[PDB]
């Protein structure tokens, strides 16, 4: 157990996260495996998953670590662990979004209860963002836009009131959240809501 961490420790100190994960995972040290796996995923969450890409090569190893960590009932502290399975859900949210499966992708984001869609949930969702891993807050910008662009597409295809109401919700949430590229994002979100009306 020690040397596998020693070897995993240096390779971690040399920015070789993809290796340090395989090594830490060899010693069943999920605290470090999931930590590093959080860093390797956040940059690639909104990216396009294409054959042989760096997304596929990382997503597919993360899923091979999700199964082996559930079938064997292994888990790190809930902070590291919650973020790890949360990113995996988001990676599915964009893989469905980039494929045009709008209905299917909308359902996933709804489960996560990460972005409010009814005005009542804004207060609690806003408080949750404060203590969510920065690997998640980083990708909040792309999530709001994809979710908006999802409602945006479904509008052009009562229901109109419902989409309009949800459109508003996303804006007020984004308005109360200080996050990455809040300037360009908050503006685009408002424009897409105006075209709906």
């Amino acid at each position: 157990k020690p040397i596998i961490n020693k070897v995993a420790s240096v390779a971690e100190n040399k920015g070789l996260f993809e290796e340090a994960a395989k090594l830490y995972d060899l010693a069943k040290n999920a605290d470090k495996v999931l930590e590093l796996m959080n860093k390797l995923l956040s940059p690639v969450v909104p990216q396009i998953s294409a054959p042989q890409s760096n997304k596929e090569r990382l997503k597919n190893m993360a899923l091979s670590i999700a199964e082996r960590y559930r079938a064997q009932g292994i888990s790190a502290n809930k902070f590291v662990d919650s973020t790890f399975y949360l990113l995996l859900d988001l990676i599915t949210f964009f893989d469905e979004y980039h494929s045009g499966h709008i209905d299917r992708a909308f359902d996933i984001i709804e489960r996560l209860k990460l972005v409010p869609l009814n005005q009542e949930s804004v207060e609690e969702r806003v408080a949750a963002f404060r203590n969510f891993s920065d690997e998640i807050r980083h990708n909040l910008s792309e999530v709001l836009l994809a979710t908006m662009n999802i409602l945006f597409t479904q509008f052009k295809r009562d229901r109109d009131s419902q989409l309009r109401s949800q459109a508003r919700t996303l804006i007020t949430f984004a308005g109360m959240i200080p996050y990455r590229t809040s300037g360009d994002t908050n503006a685009r979100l408002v424009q897409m809501e105006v075209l709906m009306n």
């Binding site: 100190n13 920015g15 940059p43 920065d134 990455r180």
Partner: protein
């Protein structure tokens, strides 16, 4: 008391500290100076993280932090100062670097120049402390991406204010190519095709 209240009184008091830092028993005095220089370094990064004042005032803060990270920090006393210095930068995180990255290639001519040269000191002093968190943050903020894109048509840009600005630009890229981790992010930017459209060669 006027770090972020008004942008008129700080200007008169920001430039006087700039020149004073460049125009610079002995042990007691050396401690008081270095002590205030460290405290004065905090209020500068604090204003940059909040994007306070006009671009002119925001430019003076870059020069102060520049010489501080270039002369004061640059031998147990040095290690303690260098260690604690990096802590202040890590406290803000992407919030601070995001403001500096936006200043570059902007409307003002002197702010973008000072901001570009400032990033050189940050990455330089960080390596002395095989990886670095400063260079990693620049990639997440899409700074390296837009930076390599500006390399095109460099012949048009190149004493003159535009000439000195490009010097700091290419100088920064040269530093990222010295660390092992920089080749990964830099190579993925496809810089070979960017320097060909300009026809500089």
């Amino acid at each position: 008391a006027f770090s972020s209240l008004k942008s008129d009184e700080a200007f008169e008091l920001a430039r006087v500290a700039k020149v004073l830092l460049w125009k610079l028993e002995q042990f007691t005095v050396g401690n008081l100076i270095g002590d205030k220089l460290f405290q004065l370094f905090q209020l500068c990064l604090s204003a940059i993280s909040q994007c306070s004042g006009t671009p002119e005032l925001r430019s003076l803060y870059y020069s102060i932090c520049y010489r501080y990270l270039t002369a004061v920090v640059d031998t147990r006393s040095v290690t303690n100062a260098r260690a604690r210095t990096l802590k202040a930068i890590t406290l803000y995180g992407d919030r601070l670097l995001n403001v500096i990255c936006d200043d570059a290639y902007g409307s003002d001519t002197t702010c973008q120049t000072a901001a570009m040269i400032l990033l050189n000191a940050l990455v330089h002093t960080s390596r002395a402390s095989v990886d670095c968190p400063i260079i990693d943050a620049l990639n997440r903020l899409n700074f390296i991406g837009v930076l390599v894109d500006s390399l095109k048509e460099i012949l048009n840009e190149w004493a003159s204010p535009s000439q000195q600005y490009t010097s700091a630009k290419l100088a920064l890229l040269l530093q990222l190519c010295q660390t092992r981790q920089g080749a990964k992010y830099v190579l993925q930017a496809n810089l070979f095709r960017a320097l060909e459209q300009s026809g500089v060669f």
